[PDB]
Each structure stands twice: as C-alpha cells, then as structure tokens.
Amino acid sequence: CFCDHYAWTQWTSCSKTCNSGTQSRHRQIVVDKYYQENFCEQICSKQETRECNWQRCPINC
Ligand SMILES: *[C@@H]1O[C@H](CO)[C@@H](O)[C@H](O)[C@@H]1O
Ligand SMILES: *[C@@H]1O[C@@H](C)[C@@H](O)[C@@H](O)[C@@H]1O
C-alpha cells in the first residue's frame, strides 16, 4: 500500500509555548475501497508526535 495516499494533517498548536511543549499530526483517513483492499491499516504509520519549543521559558527576576 501507499501510505502517502492519505495525507497528514497539520502540526497542531504547541501545548506549551516553552519548557518542552508537545504537538502532534495524523494522516487523514476515510474508510474506502483503496484502504481496505491494500491493507493500509497494518503497514502504515497513522501518527507522528514531536516535542515543540524545548527552550526553557525565560526566567525573570
Ligand atoms: C504526510 O502528509 C503531508 C501533508 O501534505 C505530505 O507532505 C506527505 O507527503 C505525507 O503523505
Ligand atoms: C509562551 O511563549 C514563550 C515565547 C514565552 O513568552 C512564555 O512566557 C510563554 O509561556
């Protein structure tokens, strides 16, 4: 199967704007012919999670 057939969504808003926040995206999947036929469920990665804004929040006096 071609996993790139079903496009990924956009990276969501960073949970924490600083101090190592997290964000995630996922493929856009609608149940149809190509999906069930080509076994796109088992051999494809449907999610990608990443840490965002790992720079420490500025410490002010
Ligand atoms: C994951 O989704 C992104 C969004 O368009 C593409 O760049 C990529 O080819 C993949 O299928
Ligand atoms: C989010 O964004 C960064 C740039 C800082 O201003 C932080 O104070 C805030 O939590």
Spatial separation of the C-alpha atoms in residues 12 and 28, rounded to whole Å: 14
How determined?
Answer: X-ray
Please give the Cα distance from 36 to 54 (Å, whole number). 39
Q: What is d(CA 34, CA 32) in angstroms, rounded to the nearest whole number?
A: 6
Range of the structural domain that residue 19 is part of: 1-58
PDB resolution in Å:
3.5
Q: Which ligand is nearest to the CA of 57?
A: 2
Q: How far apart are CA 29 and CA 40, in angstroms?
A: 10
Pocket of ligand 1 (CB under 6 A): 4, 7-8
Phi, psi of 47 (to 5 degrees): -150, 145
Please tell me the chain's helix, strand, coil percentages from 3-state DSSP, rounded to the nearest 5: 15, 25, 60
Report the C-alpha gap between 11 and 6 in whole angstroms: 16
What does the alpha-carbon distance between residue 8 and residue 5 come to, in Å, rounded to a whole number? 9
- On whether the CB atoms of residues 22 and 14 are closer than 8 A, the answer is yes
Domain count of the chain?
1
CATH code of 54's domain: 2.20.100.10
Q: Write the burial class of residue 58 (CB in 10 Å: 0-12 exposed, 13-18 middle, 19+ buried).
A: exposed
